[PDB]
Structures are given as C-alpha cells and as structure tokens.
C-alpha cells in the first residue's frame, strides 16, 4: 500500500467541492469488469499497468499543471513512477488482454474529451479528480 499514498495525494489536491459542480457530473463508464474478479490477483497486472500509465499521462499535461498544485503534482509523479516501473517489470517478465487494455484506454479517451469539451474548467477537473480517485480504488482494493 504505497498505492494508499497515491490516493492520499490525490485527496490533498482537491481545491473545490463537487457539490458546487453538480451541473457537471458525468458517467465515464469505468470498465471495472476488466480487473478484480474471476481472473483474480495477478492476471490483471497489464491492465493495472495501463491504468497507471494513463493517469501519469493525464496529470502530466500543461493543462493539469495549471489545474493543480505544482508541489503535490511532483510528489504524485514520484509515486506513479514507483508503481509504473514495478508493474512494467512484471509485464516484461513472464506473468483478450488486449481488449482489456483497449477498454482502459477508451475510458481515458472519454475523460480527456470531457475536459476538452468543458474547456478544462475547475469543475470539470474536480469531477475528473473524483472519478480517478474512485476508479483507482476499485482497480486496487
């Protein structure tokens, strides 16, 4: 649970309440089926790997810098890297996985288009932050 650390940082990044952004709430259709169940712990590494990847990509944009605290984003990247690297090492090693990865990527595509559409408003950003926050917990717990 140095993943517990990643959520803690995301929490601290919050600037505005979702309750002032109720107009902007959105269902992103997180492809949850692709993780916890059936093909249990360990067969879902590559999917989880892609997730972290996508998150890292998302929060590295100059738009993300404009949205969130520069200091926290740093501690955040450190944390993502740690995981990103460990997961990659496993993927590299031995243990429709493509469909699963595709599903994750489509999910983040939807997230990105949502922000473009909303013109990266603080509210849009808050909605997204809250989602990732949730869908990350689901991925891992």
């Amino acid at each position: 649970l140095g993943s517990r650390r990643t959520l803690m940082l995301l929490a601290q990044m919050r600037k505005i309440s979702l309750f002032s952004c109720l107009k902007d709430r959105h269902d992103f259709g997180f492809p949850q089926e692709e993780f916890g169940n059936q093909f249990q712990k360990a067969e879902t590494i590559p999917v989880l790997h892609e997730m972290i990847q996508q998150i890292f990509n998302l929060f590295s944009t100059k738009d993300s810098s404009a949205a969130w605290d520069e200091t926290l984003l740093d501690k955040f990247y450190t944390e993502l890297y740690q995981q990103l690297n460990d997961l990659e090492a496993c993927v590299i090693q031995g243990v429709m996985k493509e469909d699963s990865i595709l599903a994750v990527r489509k999910y983040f595509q939807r997230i990105t288009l949502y922000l473009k559409e909303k013109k990266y408003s603080p509210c849009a950003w808050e909605v997204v932050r809250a989602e990732i926050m949730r869908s990350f917990s689901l991925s891992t717990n």
Partner: antibody
Amino acid sequence: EVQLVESGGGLVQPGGSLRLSCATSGYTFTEYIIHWVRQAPGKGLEWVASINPDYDITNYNQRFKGRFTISLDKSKRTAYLQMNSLRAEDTAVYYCASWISDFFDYWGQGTLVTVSS
Amino acid sequence: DIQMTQSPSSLSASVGDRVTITCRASQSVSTSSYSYMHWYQQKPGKAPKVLISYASNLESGVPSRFSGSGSGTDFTLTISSLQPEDFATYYCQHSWGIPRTFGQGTKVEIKR
C-alpha cells in the same frame, strides 16, 4: 419535461421471453443513462442493467448476464430490455429509470411482468 | 459485490418525532473526500424518489427535515420532524462501481 414510459409488460409462461421498451421524452437523449430496475411484489429493489446512449457502454447485473439484453434505438428515443428463459422469480414491476451519474433523476410508472403457467 | 443492510427493517413513530434509519455497506463506499451512497423514498404504488445524494447532499425540492450523514460503510438517514406524508419505504443505494445495489428497505409508519 422529462418523461419515461415503459410498456410491453404482461403475462408469460415460464421459459418464455419478453421485450420491454422504454420511450423517453423531454431532454437531450444522449445526456442520460437509461436503466432498468425491478421490484418483486412486496420486495425490495434490484438493478438489472444500464445503457449509455452517448458512448455505447452497457452494464449488467451478473445475475441476468446470460438471459437479459439491454439495447436501444436512438432515432426512436427508446431503450429495450429483452428478457429470455423467464423463471417465476422474475415476476416483478420493471421500472425504467435515468441518471446523469451516481443516482437516479427520473423514473417511469413501472410495468408489471408476471411469469406464470 | 457490495451488499447493504438497513436497520430497522420496520419502524413506527408519531408526527413530529425524530427518526433515524441506518445503512451498512459490506465494504467502504467512500473516498477520503466523497461517499457514494444515496437515499430514496418510495411511497406505495409509486416509483422511488431520490432524497439525499452522496450521503449528505440534500436534493433540490426535498424538505429540510431530511438529512444524511455518514462515511465509509455506515450511513444514516434522519427525518427530524416526521410528517404524515412521510409514510413510505426508504432505500439506500451505492454507486461505488458495479453492480449497483440497494438495501432491503425500511418501512416507516406513522403513529396517530
């Protein structure tokens, strides 16, 4: 003024099949996710499936994965629930419901499905 | 997947009384910042009606006697001044992923 109208309910024998439809009106179609939620008489509420018209995502309660199919016709502003191999425990009022996210904003009046010989 | 247990199942109280219904999720339905648990009201022969969203956000048009608190796994609907028109069954549901599940419901009847 948002309005959800489910129809196609009635009587079927066990093992038979049915197709519920829900006709929507009064809002931009692609903005709401449409759900089916049922309720056995006297009993509690059970989520069946949802469909997202904006994208094309669907989700199912694992209980009904094999038998039930949700689908839609965007031109007709209508969502459908195809039920198969109906057991007697599928007797319930089937609500059509909508949401933008997390919680339900709108509902139909419900349509009663009775599975009996 | 996430199951929830309301208590009491059934309940009786006089008009004006304070009423408390609780809902217990089989696992956390919270982020450190938001709880994804909602409360509905179903009057007999009618579709449910959302009251509280995200554990404590009172929905538009709902009377102020209604309120929700809680986080993690333990949540509470409170009617502070029970009224005759508040006779109904009350359900909790979560939107912490899939499947979406409701509680078994809590029947509230008015003592007169």
